[PDB]
């Protein structure tokens, strides 16, 4: 009985957190309702009430995704985790996997792809690039993939990817379409079923304004078949779709314990879905598009140039901006934070050092926040050497 480690003096102080206006690519600031849900008491993780809450979230994801797929649920992990879940259940080792690598995200899909032993074929594009129906038909014809991954909202580049008909294309060639909508969901049009998407995921901490840590996923008929008929077991227990599906009530069988869901994160997630259900999807889309419209105008007035030249390809939720010559982008970002308590970001992955990223997300996608970031940047431009 004698202790190596003594109580950490830091823990003996009270928790203190500064106030910040988060106008980077995410996570975003939480509205009052979501914070309130966050502060609530626990119920039983397998209680009848928890299942009710979970059932509502499912309906919520079906609304925001625009799908009727029964195989739709929450992944108990961040965005990445939902991607990993998708890839680990859909791809058996040796399966051919076509990856739209126009930014960090396709990179991450590829990385995961290699790790789980798929034959990974990366359609690589420079940051700023998007994919045409043809490049995909071409890559599809050449490598005969079981799955294609596409980033809808490329948050690393500010690119909005077209999506239209790609699923139809992919269904000829009998290939599955996997789409990343973590950054795009809620702030730009998206219809899972109508666009024939096989696997769609998104994240909690973007336009939904919930805390980071959960993610959203849905699987088509085709996906469900491939996953339930694989010969091999997926490398992951935590992310195994058969178990997850059962516990989320997507089965005929009674719910069986798998892992303990993040009850409190779910309260918040539910509220975030409640909020956007009340606003309404198309309304939310207009707001992001209009906010984004306003923001670009202000930026160019400052003498800044937008990284993505064709406005139809510009992701409304995350805006990229070329680093103004002569300026140390690091200084600008620090300046905005130091003098304004506002977070903006640099690049990420290929776009590193090449851009600034400003985000308009959910209830934070407002004209008034655009004015704040515009003025903060202006001051930055004025004073930074």
Ligand X SMILES: *Cc1c(COP(=O)(O)O)cnc(C)c1O
Q: Residues marked as binding for substrate?
A: 357
| Residue 91 makes contact with a second copy by CB under 8 A | no
Tell which positions 243-302 bind ligand X, by CB under 6 A.
259-260
Q: What whole-number distance in Å separates Cα of residue 346 and Cα of residue 332? A: 10
User: Pick from a second copy, ligand X, none: which does 39 bind, CB < 5 to 8 A by kind?
Assistant: a second copy
User: Pick from ligand X, a second copy, none: which does 19 bind, CB < 5 to 8 A by kind?
Assistant: a second copy
Q: What whole-number distance in Å separates Cα of residue 317 and Cα of residue 309? A: 16
Tell which positions 365-384 bind ligand X, by CB under 6 A.
none
Tell which positions 139-158 bind ligand X, by CB under 6 A.
151, 153, 155
End-to-end CA distance of the chain, in Å? 59
User: Pick from a second copy, ligand X, none: which does 5 bind, CB < 5 to 8 A by kind?
Assistant: a second copy
Shortest CB 356 distance to ligand X, Å: 16
Tell which positions 242-261 bind a second copy, by CB under 8 A.
257-261
Nearer CB in complex with ligand X: 243/327: 243
DSSP element (H, E) containing 217: strand 215-219
CB within 8 Å of 255: residues ≥ 6 apart: 46, 51, 246, 247, 248, 249
| Residue 180 makes contact with ligand X by CB under 6 A | yes
| Residue 288 makes contact with a second copy by CB under 8 A | no
> What DSSP state is assigned to residue 354?
T
Q: What is the DSSP string of 20-80?
A: -EE-SSS--PPPHHHHHHHTPPP--TTSHHHHHHHHHHHHHHHHHHT---SEEEEESS-HH
Count Cβ atoms within 10 A of the Cβ of residue 65 and give its class: 0-12 exposed, 13-18 middle, 19 or more buried: buried
Tell which positions 54-83 bind ligand X, by CB under 6 A.
78-80
Residue closest to 80 by CA, chosen among 204, 177, 163, 191: 204
Q: Could you tell me the CA-to-CA distances from 51 to 46, 85, 145, 218, 275 in Å, in that order?
A: 7, 22, 37, 18, 20
| Residue 214 makes contact with ligand X by CB under 6 A | no
Quick one: tokens of 317? 């939720």
x-marked contacts with ligand X along 1-30 as a string, rule CB under 6 A? -------------------------x----
Shortest CB 46 distance to ligand X, Å: 10
DSSP element (H, E) containing 227: helix 221-228
| Residue 188 makes contact with a second copy by CB under 8 A | no
Nearer CB in complex with a second copy: 42/301: 42
Q: What whole-number distance in Å separates Cα of residue 239 and Cα of residue 227? A: 12
Tell which positions 46-65 bind a second copy, by CB under 8 A.
47, 49, 53, 55-56, 59-60, 62-63
Tell which positions 323-352 bind a second copy, by CB under 8 A.
343, 348
| Residue 106 makes contact with ligand X by CB under 6 A | no
3-state secondary structure of 129: coil
Q: Are 112 and 83 in contact (CB under 8 A)?
A: yes
Q: Which of 100, 128, 187, 211 is in the footprint of a second copy by CB under 8 A?
A: 211
| Residue 4 makes contact with a second copy by CB under 8 A | yes
Nearer CB in complex with ligand X: 319/374: 319
For the annotated binding site, the residues are 357
Segment interacting with a second copy (CB under 8 A) among 11-19, 129-137, 140-148, 365-373? 11-19
User: Pick from ligand X, a second copy, none: which does 348 bind, CB < 5 to 8 A by kind?
Assistant: a second copy
Instruction: List contacts with ligand X (CB under 6 A).
Output: 26, 78-80, 105, 151, 153, 155, 180, 182-183, 203, 212, 259-260
């Amino acid at each position: 009985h004698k202790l190596l480690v003594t109580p950490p003096k830091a823990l003996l102080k009270p928790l203190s957190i500064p106030n910040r206006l988060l106008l980077g690519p995410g996570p975003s600031n939480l509205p009052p309702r979501i914070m309130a849900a966050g502060g609530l008491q626990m119920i039983g993780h397998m209680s009848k009430e928890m299942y009710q809450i979970m059932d509502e979230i499912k309906e919520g994801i079906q609304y925001v995704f625009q799908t009727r797929n029964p195989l739709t649920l929450v992944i108990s992990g961040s965005g990445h985790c939902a991607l990993e879940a998708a890839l680990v259940n859909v791809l058996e080792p040796g399966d051919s996997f076509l990856v739209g690598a126009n930014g960090i995200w396709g990179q991450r899909a590829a990385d995961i792809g290699e790790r789980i032993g798929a034959r990974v074929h990366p359609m690589t594009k420079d940051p700023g690039g998007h994919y045409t129906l043809q490049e995909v038909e071409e890559g599809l014809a050449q490598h005969k993939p079981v799955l294609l991954f596409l980033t809808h909202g490329e948050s690393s580049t500010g690119v909005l990817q077209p999506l239209d008909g790609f699923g139809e294309l992919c269904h000829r060639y009998k290939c599955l379409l996997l789409v990343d909508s973590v950054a795009s969901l809620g702030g730009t049009p998206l219809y899972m079923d109508r666009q024939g998407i096989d696997i769609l995921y998104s994240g909690s901490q973007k336009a939904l304004n919930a805390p980071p840590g959960t993610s959203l996923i849905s699987f088509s008929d085709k996906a469900k078949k491939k996953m339930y008929s694989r010969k091999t077991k997926p490398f992951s227990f935590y992310l195994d779709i058969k178990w997850l599906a059962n516990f989320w009530g997507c089965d005929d069988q009674p719910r069986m314990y798998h892992h303990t869901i993040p009850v409190i994160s779910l309260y918040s997630l539910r509220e975030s879905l409640a909020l956007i259900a009340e606003q309404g999807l198309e309304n939310s889309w207009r707001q992001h598009r209009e906010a984004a419209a306003y923001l670009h105008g202000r930026l160019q007035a400052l003498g800044l140039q937008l990284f993505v030249k064709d406005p139809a390809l510009r992701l409304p939720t995350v805006t990229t901006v070329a680093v103004p010559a002569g300026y140390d982008w690091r200084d600008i970002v620090s300046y905005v934070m130091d003098h304004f308590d506002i977070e903006i970001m640099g690049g990420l992955g290929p776009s590193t050092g090449k851009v600034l990223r400003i985000g308009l997300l959910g209830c934070n996608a407002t004209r008034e926040n655009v004015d704040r970031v515009t003025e903060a940047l202006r001051a930055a431009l004025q004073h930074c050497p």
